[PDB]
Symmetry: C5
Subunit: 56 residues, 5 copies
């Protein structure tokens, strides 16, 4: 192909690489959010077990 | 390779790049929904703690 | 480069593009499942709220 | 480009295509885990409702 | 098009490929977090069943 056409594609690919990098960071922020929920659920589970034992 | 073939692929790539932006947007909408659920759960956990601690 | 090897790459990219579309659909189907769950969690939280108020 | 550079790229793309397919299968496996969880939650929700009803 | 420009694209694609492998690992780690959460929920569900049974 012409250099001009290839350069358009390579810079387009660079935009995609940047978008993917952002999505990867977004996904990891979601993972952090999910871990925070999981730990909050663990705290609930322990509080429940405590209550259910005392009120069994 | 040749121009006509390359131009077609460059177009196909750009269509994929646009679809990737829409997926990234879909994932962020999901992240907001998930955070909403996580905070709703956090609210529930605090109400459960109040019931179990302050009223039992 | 060889037109014929480029033809293979173009086809393999089309295959990737279709698989990406399948994944994007699957992700959006997952979002619908997450929405059903989030709604179900709301059902529970609101039921618990009522219960707690009556048993405070 | 030269055929050698292109052919290396095409081989690298085929490897990425295979990894993407793997990820899409991983994502679909997750969707099964999520649906199983959603169903477990709907069953908890019914059992909570039954408890709250019988305990009026 | 030129070998120099192709070499730059090939480098960018290799970097994307590596990022994708990282993301796929991150997704698998999330899947593991999710399964552990699902099992935690099942453990709660059993605790709640045992508690509710004793209030009949």
């Amino acid at each position: 192909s012409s250099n001009a056409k290839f350069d358009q594609f390579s810079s387009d690919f660079q935009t995609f690489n940047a978008k993917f990098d952002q999505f990867s960071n977004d996904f990891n922020a979601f993972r952090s959010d999910f871990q925070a929920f999981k730990d909050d659920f663990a705290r609930f589970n322990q509080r429940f077990d405590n209550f259910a034992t005392k009120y069994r």
